[PDB]
Write a protein that binds this ligand. Structure first.
Ligand SMILES: C[C@H]1C[C@@H](O)CN(c2ncc(Cl)c(Nc3ccc4c(c3)c3c(c(=O)n4C)OCC(F)(F)[C@H](C4CC4)N3)n2)C1
Ligand SMILES: C[C@H]1C[C@@H](O)CN(c2ncc(Cl)c(Nc3ccc4c(c3)c3c(c(=O)n4C)OCC(F)(F)[C@H](C4CC4)N3)n2)C1
Ligand SMILES: [Cl-]
Ligand SMILES: [Cl-]
Lengths: 131, 131
């Protein structure tokens, strides 16, 4: 082996990062050490600010702001689709994007708003493949 | 590609977990949203509780405790070697363990205390290879 010699001196553990991400998603499911509620229209999503910042240019800008870093509730634009945000929040914590014909437009618009560039590029490529 | 078809329905992003871990280590280096000081003898190490819990059976037990989850300072056993803790803290945030002849005993004892089982097993195998 579960480890290898890295390019540098250190031994590297193959599944470390994905196992850490799995444990962070386990904490999220159990509502452990969650420190923010993201409100999208009617819905509320509990999460860890550090995970949101690590996965979004918008959350990175918000939580690096001296004033907003201390907020426990963040309201997103009411035009953001809650299902699209939920798919992207799941992706942040798992590396898996449940992209489908019925949700791809909402996922793309939400990823543009959240500043998740590679997800936007992937959504554009899948849309382009159908036209 | 930077994505593939996963075993399940979802598309999976190959470098997502290690890129998230890199961003969490960037936040740690800049002291952004760190919420705990770990004290080992004289030294102090700032970190994110969620990362410590995701990487240690001891931190998982401490921060799931209703009383200790709210502590901003955690003092480890004064017999814990600060350098060994520093190597393991770096490993938690990077997946890379800087294991060497001069630090392997301290890294192993610290990983046993912190409940990082695979790191203990790896330390034992490297020690066994020299005898
Ligand atoms: C000096 C500072 C200056 C800062 O613009 C950058 N850096 C940075 N440092 C720390 C953090 Cl927490 C951070 N967050 C951050 C910022 C922008 C991001 C993504 C993440 C982000 C993005 C994305 O498109 N953008 C634009 O894609 C969505 C994603 F989930 F796949 C990724 C995850 C895999 C890592 N995260 N970005 C370095
Ligand atoms: C129902 C709950 C019941 C709980 O014992 C388990 N689970 C669990 N859920 C959430 C978390 Cl945050 C968690 N943390 C946790 C607990 C124990 C651990 C490691 C991590 C841990 C360990 C380790 O040996 N142990 C014993 O190795 C050190 C490491 F950095 F490589 C890993 C990192 C790669 C993931 N983390 N463990 C599930
Ligand atoms: Cl708000
Ligand atoms: Cl203490």
């Amino acid at each position: 082996n579960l480890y290898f010699q890295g390019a540098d001196s250190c031994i590297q553990f193959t599944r470390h990062a994905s196992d850490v991400l799995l444990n962070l998603n386990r904490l999220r499911s159990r509502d452990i050490l969650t420190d923010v509620v993201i409100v999208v229209s009617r819905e509320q999503f509990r999460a860890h600010k550090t995970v949101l910042m690590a996965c979004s240019g918008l959350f990175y800008s918000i939580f690096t702001d001296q004033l907003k870093c201390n907020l426990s509730v963040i309201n997103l634009d009411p035009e953001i689709n809650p299902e699209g945000f939920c798919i992207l929040l799941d992706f942040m914590y798992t590396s898996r994007l449940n992209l489908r014909e019925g949700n791809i437009m909402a996922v793309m618009a939400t990823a543009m708003y959240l500043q998740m560039e590679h997800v936007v590029d992937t959504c554009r490529k899948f849309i382009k493949a159908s036209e």
